[PDB]
UniProtKB/Swiss-Prot annotation, chain D:
Function: Flagellin is the subunit protein which polymerizes to form the filaments of bacterial flagella. FlaD is not essential for flagellar synthesis and motility.
Any further remark recorded for this protein: V.cholerae is able to differentially regulate the flagellins within the flagellum maybe to produce flagella which are particularly suited for motility within a given environment.
Family the entry assigns: Belongs to the bacterial flagellin family.
Record's protein name: Flagellin D
Coiled-coil segments: 48-74
Compartments, as annotated in UniProt: Secreted; Bacterial flagellum
Subunit structure: Heteromer of multiple flagellin subunits including FlaA, FlaB, FlaC, FlaD and FlaE.
Length: 53, 54, 269, 108, 54, 53, 54, 53
């Protein structure tokens, strides 16, 4: 019983590295992406200066 | 279409990994007990005839 | 929604295989204990054993009986008992939509479960060592209704001039539905496994008339007594009937696992 | 217009391959269940097996049978059931202009 | 699922390992003693018959 | 009978180490392969950031 | 059944009350406030023998 | 009595390498992983300077 109980407890609480590792890698990508976009976004107002010329 | 929100390829590999991992456990279990049928899921008929032969 | 639902479904299915695995494991030990009890019963049958010897064996059989009951009233899955009978026809949803659930029924594995036994008919006329099958009175008729209700009529023509013990062996060989055994007095007993025969067996024929078979008393593993050779032979059968019941439940669970495993594979794809 | 239409057409065809993928994948498990049944059948056929054994085999057979029916009544593409008979003869417009559609039929 | 906080494979292997260890010790005793019924745990009824015969 | 019965019980219940071991070996190798391709798979999104912000 | 077996059976039949036996061999029924509110009116022939107290 | 008592003492005191050796390995893998996550974490704050700077 203990063996099967332990196995069951695993399915509900253990971490599936395969799934989590991919999730971490995915999170970092979206992160670096957003950062690059954000940097590009901060430059948006710079346009006005030229119009003000 | 390089995509970040989805990596179907990863899912495919993980699926086959889970297949291979479960396979190892089944084999290892059989090796340790020395018994091919250690549960009905292995062979219900065997479980029956083997228990009766036992 | 479907993807997330399928994920939850896979989990639900994993829970199902887990609850089943635990129950199957418990039934495994149940089988081992039953087998031990059967062997002890055969040892008890040997005439060499005196009452004291049979008393000793009975003590162990009492212990194992209690252990069987314990396993059944204790085996639990985080608190839900799985073998006492409380768990019954529980549905395990294994899909991303409502209604996709697949049913699962765990049967009571208590040593007194009606299935874990049968009925015992004992003859009234004891035959001495010098009693032989009389010519013309060697016919015994077994009219019973199997398990599916289909009625069967086993007609055993005993070999002329055979001892009561040989009569039993002959019957045991000319059929598998009923099991025969000779008690200390020679009164032949007939055990009918509830799993095999249902309702009530009817004994007709000249040999039957000579034996004067009586009514059947419901016998379960919980009611076995190896203190008397007659009880010993009867017990061997009672345990055999049970071993079937137990294996049958295990086999069904076996499929439940295989099916749920298959569902998981289809679900992930 | 042709360019815009071509874009939607590529999308529609991608959906088409997607539906086929889902159905074909489900049938992969269908096949395994059937093959398992075949081996169990060949087992039951062997003479050594007794009636009791055949009963046991049947139980596993019956369970697998229900699974085929489950897979058939469940495999879906967002509520659109696929391999049960309800989905059949559906055209997939893979062309920019109208009347350019390949037909797909999913058998029960 | 390549999990780490659990290893049922090992737990299964150990259960059988113990079984073997005990079985080894059980037979080793009988071999050294020269008597199969070393303890009442074996053939409780035989113990009684053996003792009565002895 | 006991001898033949035991032999009969084995054929249906015994573990043929030869085939079983071979299987386990293959299983482990397959697992290592899946793990290797899983590693390369996680790197997929990396292309996106490399493509551009 | 022995008093212990009574407790195990009771523990298997219900979840509201958890039964146990003290050294004197007196059945002890515990009820969790989280599951049971108020008193517990034990009744029946067995309770007549056990004589559950306050 | 000595033999039985020594058997009893073992169960409560001697260590079972079977479980112990396993427990050690588990701790080792978890520690190795934990540190790997810690290394990733240490670099996480670098995002601000790296991008917005």
């Amino acid at each position: 019983i203990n063996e099967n109980v332990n196995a069951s407890k695993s399915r509900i609480k253990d971490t599936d590295f395969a799934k989590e590792t991919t999730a971490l890698t995915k999170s970092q990508i979206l992160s670096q992406a957003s950062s690059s976009v954000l940097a590009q976004a901060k430059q948006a107002p710079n346009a006005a200066l030229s119009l003000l010329g | 279409a390089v995509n970040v929100n989805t990596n179907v390829a990863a899912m495919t590999a993980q699926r086959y990994l889970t297949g291979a991992t479960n396979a190892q456990q089944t084999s290892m279990e059989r090796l340790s007990s020395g018994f091919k049928i250690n549960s009905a899921k292995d062979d219900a008929a065997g479980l029956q005839i083997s228990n009766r032969l036992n | 929604v479907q993807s997330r639902g399928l994920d939850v479904a896979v989990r639900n299915a994993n829970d199902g295989i887990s609850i089943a695995q635990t129950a199957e494991g418990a039934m495994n030990e149940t089988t081992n204990i039953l087998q031990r009890m059967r062997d002890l019963s055969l040892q008890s049958a040997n005439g060499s054993n005196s009452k004291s010897e049979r008393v000793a064996i009975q003590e162990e059989i009492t212990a194992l009986n209690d252990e069987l009951n314990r396993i059944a009233e204790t085996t639990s899955f985080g608190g839900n008992k799985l073998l006492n009978g409380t768990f019954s026809t529980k549905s395990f949803q294994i899909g991303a939509d409502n209604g996709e659930a697949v049913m699962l029924t765990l049967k009571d594995m208590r040593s007194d479960n009606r299935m874990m036994g049968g009925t015992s008919y004992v003859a009234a006329e004891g035959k001495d060592k010098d009693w032989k099958v009389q010519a013309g009175a060697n016919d015994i008729t077994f009219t019973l209704k199997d398990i599916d209700g289909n009625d069967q009529t086993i007609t055993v023509n005993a070999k002329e001039g055979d001892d009561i013990e040989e009569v039993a062996t002959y019957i045991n060989g000319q059929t598998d539905m009923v099991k025969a055994s000779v008690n200390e007095k020679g009164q032949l007993q007939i055990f009918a496994g509830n799993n095999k025969v249902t309702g009530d067996v009817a004994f007709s024929g000249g040999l039957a008339g000579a034996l004067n078979m009586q009514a059947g008393t419901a016998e379960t593993v919980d009611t076995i007594d190896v203190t008397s050779v007659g009880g010993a032979q009867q017990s061997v059968a009672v345990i055999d009937s049970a071993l079937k019941y137990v294996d049958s439940h295990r086999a069904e669970l076996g499929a439940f696992q295989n099916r749920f495993n298959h569902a998981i594979s289809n679900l992930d794809n």
